[PDB]
Design a protein around this ligand. Structure first.
Ligand SMILES: N[C@@H](Cc1ccc(O)cc1)C(=O)O
Ligand SMILES: N[C@@H](Cc1ccc(O)cc1)C(=O)O
Lengths: 245, 245
């Protein structure tokens, strides 16, 4: 797959493979973060305790923004692959700009979920995967980096659902146009996902978790994933598809 | 293991576990980088082609330094765990300084291998693990990040050999003092490593590689590791130990 070649992106088996790569990650990112306590202070807004000059926003926010700025000068946020959490602060690169051919529909950028992702990460995911609850002041830096990477993995995967949904639409125009025209959510819902194949994916994902690393059993993790992360993946697909005509 | 508790660091089973975590990584970092071409320009000194203002040094150097500066403000380079590649440019943190009790001998900082690590990475490792040779200009940023992470994993592991060797020395003072006093390298050599246990580690490591991802077979990779990386690990142990009295 290459984002400079539409045909290679819209290819179903290719995306199929890409996801396997971007879904295994989120799982590896979670297993990493699961070695630290909850560290509420790392998220409490306005960074209570850290003397950050006029910064307003959690410690996590400062760190993530700070690291997104550093990562941008090397073209990280120019690929249709990446969507930053702080667009208003990412710098430009001293490397040549790459011509990425249009693949998705124009409105595509309007379909952004970043703020939702971080909200479920911090409120719903963290409490479940932490080693324990409480601030671990000697690891605020380690923990913060972990979140930034778990946020980065959740985003890229979730937002890749526009390509996943665009490839699908185009794989069967006649079918989707009808579903879309009748604003039939559930119709769309059942055609972009096969229970038979989704489960085998999760069965594979569980096996990876165990062999990788790991209080949190492999199967329990895959369910945290299946029940809090998956639903958001599909919200991007149906939103995109509905306004596709 | 906690670097604020000497007893928990010097603990043999703990380090045993830590390595398993820091050795599996290097392997995951290699499998990642193995999806890109060699990109010689990314290493060619003085960055031929990239208009970097008075910078002198490869593109990799600019990137790595740039990202080490960003990672430092969150205490990354204060833990006895991390040793930067560009000490003369890492900033300070706006977070409280952590009191890390002395564990290793005073001369410890003199035993630095960073420049060797990057030299074997770029000249010996890259040519073997790349998908192919040649510049892949549309990925110089992706590739560069991969190296930074493979450099970061190689370092932390290799330099952790001072703790690994200090724990050993202290685990059997009488034994090591004799070996050291006679400047008996091979003696030291055979006592810090058991062929029986080293192989089981590699056997385990191979299994991980396969299940993780993967031209480069799992077993072939583990050998690249065993033959170019391991030797440097032991060079840190014997150097440290020799000047331990
Ligand atoms: N664990 C230390 C040092 C550290 C910080 C950030 C890192 O990415 C790595 C290590 C801290 O949290 O202060
Ligand atoms: N692959 C693109 C964008 C990119 C850069 C750096 C990254 O960390 C990620 C993506 C590039 O190399 O320019």
């Amino acid at each position: 797959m290459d984002f400079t070649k539409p045909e290679t992106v819209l290819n179903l088996q290719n995306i199929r493979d890409e996801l396997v790569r971007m879904e295994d990650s989120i799982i590896f990112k979670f297993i990493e973060r699961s070695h630290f306590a909850t560290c509420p202070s790392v998220y409490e807004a306005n960074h209570p305790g850290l003397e950050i000059p006029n910064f307003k926003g959690s410690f996590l926010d400062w760190a993530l923004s700070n690291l997104e700025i550093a990562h941008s000068r090397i073209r990280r946020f120019e690929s249709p692959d990446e969507t930053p959490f702080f667009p208003d602060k990412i710098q430009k690169s001293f490397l040549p700009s790459i011509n990425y051919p249009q693949i998705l529909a124009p409105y595509a950028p309007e379909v952004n979920y970043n703020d939702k992702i971080k909200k479920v990460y911090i409120e719903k995911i963290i409490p479940l995967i932490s080693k324990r609850d409480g601030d671990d002041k000697n690891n605020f830096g380690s923990v913060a980096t972990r979140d930034i990477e778990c946020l980065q993995s959740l985003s890229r995967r979730i937002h890749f659902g526009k390509f996943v949904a665009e490839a699908k639409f185009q794989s069967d125009i006649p079918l989707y146009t009808k579903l879309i025209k009748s604003k039939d959510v559930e119709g769309i819902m059942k055609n972009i996902t096969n229970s038979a194949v989704e489960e085998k994916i999760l069965e594979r994902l569980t096996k990876k978790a165990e062999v990788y690393g790991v209080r949190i059993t492999p199967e329990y993790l895959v369910k945290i994933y299946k029940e809090i992360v998956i639903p958001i993946t599909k919200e991007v697909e149906v939103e995109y598809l509905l306004r596709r005509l």
